[PDB]
Design an enzyme around this catalytic site. Structure first.
Site, PDB file in Angstrom:
ATOM      1  N   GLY A 868      26.730 -11.150   9.628  1.00  0.00           N
ATOM      2  CA  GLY A 868      25.243 -11.391  10.008  1.00  0.00           C
ATOM      3  C   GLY A 868      24.546 -10.006  10.490  1.00  0.00           C
ATOM      4  O   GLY A 868      23.632  -9.529   9.758  1.00  0.00           O
ATOM      5  N   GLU A 869      25.103  -9.475  11.609  1.00  0.00           N
ATOM      6  CA  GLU A 869      24.579  -8.137  11.884  1.00  0.00           C
ATOM      7  C   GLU A 869      24.876  -6.844  11.314  1.00  0.00           C
ATOM      8  O   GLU A 869      24.333  -5.838  11.638  1.00  0.00           O
ATOM      9  CB  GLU A 869      24.728  -8.255  13.457  1.00  0.00           C
ATOM     10  CG  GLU A 869      23.931  -9.399  13.993  1.00  0.00           C
ATOM     11  CD  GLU A 869      24.376  -9.501  15.578  1.00  0.00           C
ATOM     12  OE1 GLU A 869      23.813  -9.421  16.321  1.00  0.00           O
ATOM     13  OE2 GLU A 869      25.518  -9.823  15.561  1.00  0.00           O
ATOM     14  N   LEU A 870      25.873  -6.903  10.560  1.00  0.00           N
ATOM     15  CA  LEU A 870      26.320  -5.492   9.968  1.00  0.00           C
ATOM     16  C   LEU A 870      25.330  -4.767   9.361  1.00  0.00           C
ATOM     17  O   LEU A 870      25.130  -3.586   9.456  1.00  0.00           O
ATOM     18  CB  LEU A 870      27.584  -5.808   8.831  1.00  0.00           C
ATOM     19  CG  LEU A 870      28.014  -4.443   8.279  1.00  0.00           C
ATOM     20  CD1 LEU A 870      28.617  -3.211   9.373  1.00  0.00           C
ATOM     21  CD2 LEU A 870      29.097  -4.865   7.186  1.00  0.00           C
TER      22      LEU A 870
END
Ligand code: PCD
Ligand code: FES
Ligand code: FES
Ligand code: CL
Ligand code: CL
Ligand code: CL
Ligand code: MG
Ligand code: MG
Length: 907
Positions: A868-870
């Site tokens: 999700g945050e990569l």
């Protein structure tokens, strides 16, 4: 009033309307066509696009007097329905263009208007059309939408069979790793998924609609509230204030660190003593409609004593500053990082040192759907809250003491929702609706408008940062020093945790044996901090990834090569002294290296004296998990009709909780040959789903994915027949055997970072990637165009490629906004999509390139990490490094607004 006989979705409608009414309200409220979605209400987002006599218009800015007698209107309901999808709807599903889905009706109707005027558009034609019609998406990065339009066009054109819009099973039946569509996509593309505002319209008469009475100053002592005139206004039931709250009237941060100087009970539910930020809710008006509640809320009189406000971290942290929370210092938390040897002498003798001061600001989440929630007293006597919470169990415990309920007396449920990107790791409206439902006994519904979404939900916390490196001539990093100041606004929830993220991620990606740093958390009167996708990494790694390029520049080294020299390899440890679990950065760098060289050559070749092209690199790292030995639970149940329900509280912002559950369960269930359509997911509910944990920290595919896997393995054992084969439901029941089976999983190797040294093993799975940005800078205007973005991504193993591709495109697009245009600094100026710099389609390049370089994770389910945050960890560092490559100047304080770029060019 006027009678208007028109045709809507092919059917004659005898309409009775006010001439001044908005078409959006008429279609949604009078005709029940809730597939016309309403977001901004200001003509800026396209969610409410409809076709009116052949033209795509935004219904929210179209008054009924503009709709001629006899007019033709088309909404998503008339484009197609679930068992009668139009080619654009089928293409949307195939191409994964519905993530949260909130923009999908508006884009699909808009795209039908395009194809009805240009049957065979170029991809550029598609982008120009969505730009002119203001079709905004915060989830997808637009490329999947354009893919879907092109595919649909080809079918409508007879160039290809419509059946090529239908997913083809890989034949073998594996859906892990495939492009199997997400279960909710058909509802999203047909406008038949009810989001919270839609549910509001379908609640019974008797439901009360709420409006907030909000502070219009940033800091004050409250003296009194006069509701007298408001009570006399049309439709008004009552006004709720702090006097009506039955608990502490405070939200708890719940896991406030022991060395926090604050007790974490600072945030009120309804302000009683003070205003701490502009927008603070001081009262709620209850009325028969949102319009009547809002009109009366404007007449509630709040007597305030305005106080000087501190609107930035440095101001509030001044040694002299007055305490915002009397009794607690404004600087309420510090996290040191102490790794290796003392850095002072290493700096003193290193061949090369570099240092910078950096800033990343108050990025606004800008989901297309503004916050909305509702509550009611159940027949069982419990208070039920339905909201955009992405942590239903977490928020239960954060608000129950304040609203005055025991955990057995309150139920939180996540509605389908139109994106959050982190803001819903915080409570927003849940305690407000619970207090009102409890006080009135009636169902209550609260919708924020977009100005309220901007001003009165939480924000990425700004960080003021100073980072330094010491290195050898060959580029080997020797030591780092770091200092960061986190402006968390007035409410402490997760502020100390966010500050600890700076110890974990400043400098991540490289072996750095010796570190000395300190993060400080400060209360201010600007917007309170809520997680924003990346949560500490976009700040931390902007600083260290920009600084790596400054170190490369200074050494006369290629910045990609400098990163290759230092990237994690076996034996190395990350900043908290933990060994990485996989080593994929050298591999990704090696695979990116020729693309980077080609990009540099293109840039050099295609630059002009006024349009300078550049190429920039960065690395991103982030954990998958909450810190320490995080855990999740799932239940796998064989149902009487042979389907299987996988019960979890995997909260869906729109990222794909449904397909993550189905895809993971399908793979775990392969021994029993369970078809993907027979696997059911559950919406999060604190009473009837297990505590799977919040969808924050890119954690659910790892934590809940592993718990689903285990539950499913456990269900296979419960179903196994001796000798081979499986019992059916009927067989197990006749046998009195169980059919609903629990699974749990814990990240047992992880440990919390130490309060004194910052060292520990906080996550057992990380995400790793390498970004390349290609930009063009107009040196007369300072305007930067991002012409391409590339992410080398190691996600271990893909549960679903439609889901991971779309996650990466969407994150890269938010990184273009963080880099060039987005902030929430001026309470007025930044309270609309366009004022805050939302990226429309032309700001995001069509060239969004992904290369998966997947190193299976020892502890992830089937080897997966999260994703999700990569993509938002450092794309904005890659972009600012590309502006520096193009032009030779460095923007240290985001965003890189054109005037700021001009000032640097001309310095
Ligand atoms: N390997 C892999 C990984 C993953 N996946 C997928 O992907 C997704 C995601 O996942 P993850 O990573 O695990 O995550 P989650 O946990 O589920 O979620 C969360 C995230 O998610 C994201 N994304 C998104 N998208 C969208 N559309 N929307 C939104 O809103 C959002 N949000 C954001 C955020 S912000 Mo925070 O809270 O700040 O920390 S965190 C976050 C899902 O569906 C899954 O399943 C796959 O497939 N594979
Ligand atoms: S353009 Fe109409 S709701 Fe945003
Ligand atoms: S899918 Fe477009 S805004 Fe979420
Ligand atoms: Cl953040
Ligand atoms: Cl700057
Ligand atoms: Cl500007
Ligand atoms: Mg070494
Ligand atoms: Mg100037």
């Amino acid at each position: 009033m006027i009678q208007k006989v028109i045709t809507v979705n092919g059917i004659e409608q005898n309409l009775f309307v006010d001439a001044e009414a908005l078409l959006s309200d008429v279609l949604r409220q009078q005709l029940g066509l809730t597939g016309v979605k309403v977001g901004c209400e200001q003509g800026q987002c396209g969610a409410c696009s409809v076709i009116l006599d052949g033209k795509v218009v935004r219904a929210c800015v179209t008054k009924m007097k503009r709709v001629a007698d006899g007019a033709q209107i088309t909404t998503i309901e008339g484009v197609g329905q679930p068992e009668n999808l139009h080619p654009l709807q089928k293409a949307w599903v195939l191409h994964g263009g519905a993530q949260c889905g909130f923009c999908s009706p508006g884009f699909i109707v808009s795209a039908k208007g395009l194809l009805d005027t240009n049957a065979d558009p170029s991809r550029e034609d598609v982008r120009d059309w969505f730009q002119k019609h203001r079709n905004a998406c915060r989830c997808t990065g637009y490329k999947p939408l354009v893919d879907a339009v092109m595919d649909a066009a080809a079918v409508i054109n007879g160039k290809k069979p419509e059946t090529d819009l239908e997913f083809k099973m890989p034949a073998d039946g594996r859906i892990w790793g495939s492009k199997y569509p997400r279960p909710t996509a058909v509802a999203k593309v047909t406008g038949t998924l009810d989001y919270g505002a839609d549910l509001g319209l379908k609640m019974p008469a008797g439901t009360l609609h709420l409006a907030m009475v909000q502070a219009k100053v940033s800091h004050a002592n409250i003296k009194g509230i006069d509701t007298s005139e408001a009570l006399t206004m049309p439709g008004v039931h009552s006004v709720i204030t702090h006097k009506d709250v039955k608990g502490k009237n405070r939200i708890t941060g719940l896991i406030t660190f022991p060395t926090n100087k604050g007790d974490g009970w600072d945030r009120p539910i309804l302000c009683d003593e003070k205003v701490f930020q502009y927008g603070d809710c001081i009262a709620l008006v209850c009325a028969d409609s949102e319009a009547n509640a809002r009109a009366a809320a404007e007449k509630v009189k709040v007597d305030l004593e305005e106080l000087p406000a501190y609107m930035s971290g440095p101001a509030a942290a001044a040694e002299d500053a007055i305490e915002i929370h009397p009794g607690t210092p404004n600087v309420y938390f510090e996290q040191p990082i102490v790794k290796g040897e003392d850095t002072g002498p290493i700096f003193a003798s290193a061949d090369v040192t570099v240092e910078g001061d950096f800033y990343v600001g108050r990025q606004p989440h800008m989901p297309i759907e503004p916050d909305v929630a509702f509550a009611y007293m159940g027949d069982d006597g419990k208070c039920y809250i339905h909201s955009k919470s992405i942590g239903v169990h977490l928020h239960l415990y954060m608000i129950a003491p304040g609203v005055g309920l025991e955990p057995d007396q309150l139920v939180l449920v996540a509605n389908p929702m139109g994106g959050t990107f982190g803001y819903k790791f915080s409570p927003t409206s849940e305690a407000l609706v619970a207090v009102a439902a409890m006080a009135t006994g009636r169902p209550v519904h609260l919708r924020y408008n977009y100005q309220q979404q901007q001003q009165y939900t939480g924000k990425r916390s700004p960080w003021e940062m100073n980072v330094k490196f010491a290195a050898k001539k060959d580029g080997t990093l020797l030591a780092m020093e770091s200092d960061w100041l986190v402006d968390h606004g007035p409410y402490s929830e997760f502020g100390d945790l966010l500050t600890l993220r700076g110890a974990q991620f400043i400098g991540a990606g490289y072996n750095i044996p010796n570190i000395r740093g300190l993060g400080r958390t400060v209360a201010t009167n600007h917007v309170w901090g809520s997680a924003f996708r990346g949560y500490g990494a976009p700040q931390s790694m902007f600083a260290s990834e920009c600084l790596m390029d400054m170190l490369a520049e200074k050494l006369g080294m290629d910045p990609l090569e400098l990163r290759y020299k230092n990237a994690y390899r076996p034996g190395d440890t990350n900043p908290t002294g933990q060994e990485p679990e996989v080593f994929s950065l050298p591999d990704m760098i090696d695979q990116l290296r020729p693309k980077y060289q080609a990009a540099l050559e293109k840039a050099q070749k295609e630059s002009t004296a006024t349009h300078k092209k550049g190429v920039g690199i960065s690395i991103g790292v982030y954990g998958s998990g909450l810190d320490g030995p995080d855990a999740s639970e799932a239940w796998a149940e064989l149902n009487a009709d042979g389907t299987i329900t996988v019960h979890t509280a995997w909260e869906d912002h729109g990222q794909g909780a449904d397909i993550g559950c189905v895809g993971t369960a399908h793979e775990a269930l392969r021994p029993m040959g369970v078809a993907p359509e027979k696997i059911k997911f559950t919406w999060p509910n604190t009473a009837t789903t297990p505590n799977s944990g919040p969808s924050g920290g890119s954690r659910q595919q790892v934590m809940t994915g592993n718990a689903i896997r285990v539950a499913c393995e456990n269900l296979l054992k419960a179903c196994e027949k001796p000798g081979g084969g499986y019992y059916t439901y009927d067989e197990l029941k006749a046998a009195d055997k169980p059919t609903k089976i629990t699974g749990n999983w814990t990240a047992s190797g992880a440990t919390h970072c130490d309060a004194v040294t910052g060292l520990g093993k906080p996550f057992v799975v990380y995400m790793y990637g390498v970004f390349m940005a290609e930009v063009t800078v107009d040196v007369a205007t300072g305007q930067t165009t991002v012409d391409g973005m590339t992410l080398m991504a190691d996600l271990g193993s893909l549960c679903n490629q439609l889901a991971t591709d779309g996650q990466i495109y969407g994150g890269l697009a938010q990184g273009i906004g963080l880099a060039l245009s987005e902030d929430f600094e001026d309470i007025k100026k930044h309270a609309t999509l366009v004022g805050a710099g939302f990226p429309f389609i032309k700001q995001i390049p069509d060239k969004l390139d992904i290369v998966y370089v997947n190193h299976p994770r020892p502890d992830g389910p089937f080897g997966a990490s999260g994703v999700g945050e990569l993509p938002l960890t450092s794309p904005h560092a890659a972009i600012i490094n590309a502006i520096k490559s193009a032009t030779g100047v460095r923007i240290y304080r985001l965003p890189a607004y054109p005037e700021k770029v001009l000032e640097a060019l001309k310095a």
